Design a protein around this ligand. Structure first.
Ligand SMILES: Cc1cc(CNCCS(C)(=O)=O)ccc1Br
Length: 330
């Protein structure tokens, strides 16, 4: 089997991408944030505290003839930004882009944090990291991809995120028309449950490539590119007037600036992020200070190749027995 679904930016900045997902019978379509940095499929639901729902589409398990309470199971997830959600668990039929999994754990939110409530466009998350990170207790549950894998033509999914435009998530096949040149594959460590890999270096603009190992994760659920402070300082030093602002929470730059590109290495291959992808617009409406798309990872504990980086590439998440990542230009 295969599946193919369009993923659409939630706003004009590509802050996140939403993909329609069919849950239950008859189908209830929710727009989920596909997140290769987490491993829970959770949704706003008829069980979510009413004051914490503000425009999201909800899953109502009582209206699905295929829903079954997973008795005793609960979940609770704290994310890197301090956001959280928690609740109980149903199994139900879940389809993405024509690919159907029966018996998928659908984690129904009883509580969500302000960052989700304030985001009327995101109806939940579909985790695509390794199932060892799934938070369901006392019986950990598998991700949608892990449940689908055996049925797929090939045990892979691909992320093709657009810049200020829709893109595609494919399951089970590699669309050879969706990228240019060749795909360069690189080793993955699953020891932290992430799609963790080592970039071979970077360049700023037309500058020379610096060969240096940068361990980080491929995370579709993170907006920006978070890298070591040395790398980030080298980038922003090429933008007149750019500075790190403790009050804003990262590097800002004059909105009148033209940003240089940023290149990252994948083995001997190079992925170029155009400068425009690094502009996240005014820090507040009307401001001439703009927020940068490359930020320091120093306070995180891990480097994160988020959407800013991934949208510059066609990315293969190869879930074979020994997983690997592939990157191609496009
Ligand atoms: C939309 C959304 C998604 C996620 C999942 N990824 C978060 C990545 S990080 C580096 O910020 O911890 C959390 C919160 C919201 Br709100």
């Amino acid at each position: 089997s295969t599946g193919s679904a369009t993923t659409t930016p939630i706003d004009s900045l590509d802050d996140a991408y939403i993909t329609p997902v069919q849950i239950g019978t008859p189908a209830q379509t929710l727009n989920l944030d596909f997140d290769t940095g987490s491993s829970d499929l959770w949704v706003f639901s008829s069980e979510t505290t009413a004051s914490e729902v503000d425009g999201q589409t909800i899953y109502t398990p009582s209206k699905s003839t295929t829903a079954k309470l997973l008795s005793g199971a609960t979940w609770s997830i704290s994310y890197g930004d301090g956001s959280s959600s928690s609740g109980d668990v149903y199994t139900d039929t879940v389809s993405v882009g024509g690919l159907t999994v029966t018996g998928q754990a659908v984690e129904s939110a009883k509580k969500v944090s302000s960052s989700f409530t304030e985001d009327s466009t995101i109806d939940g998350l579909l985790g695509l990291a390794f199932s060892t990170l799934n938070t369901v207790s006392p019986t950990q549950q598998k991700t949608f991809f892990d449940n689908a894998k055996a049925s797929l033509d090939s045990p892979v999914f691909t992320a093709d995120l657009g810049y200020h435009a829709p893109g595609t998530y494919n399951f089970g096949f590699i669309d050879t028309t969706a990228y240019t040149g060749s795909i360069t594959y690189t080793a993955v460590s699953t020891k932290q449950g992430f799609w963790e890999w080592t970039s071979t270096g970077y360049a700023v603009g037309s500058g020379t490539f610096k060969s240096t190992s940068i361990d980080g994760i491929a995370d579709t659920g993170t907006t920006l590119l978070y890298l070591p402070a040395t790398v980030v300082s080298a980038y922003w030093a090429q933008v007149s007037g750019a500075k790190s602002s403790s009050s804003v929470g990262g590097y800002v730059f004059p909105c009148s600036a033209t940003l240089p590109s940023f290149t990252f290495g994948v083995g001997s291959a190079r992925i170029v992020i155009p400068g425009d992808y690094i502009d996240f617009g005014p820090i507040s409406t009307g401001s001439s200070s703009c927020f940068g798309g490359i930020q320091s990872s120093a306070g995180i504990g891990i480097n994160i190749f988020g959407d800013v980086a991934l949208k510059a590439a066609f990315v293969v998440f190869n879930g074979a027995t020994t997983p690997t990542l592939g990157f191609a230009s496009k």
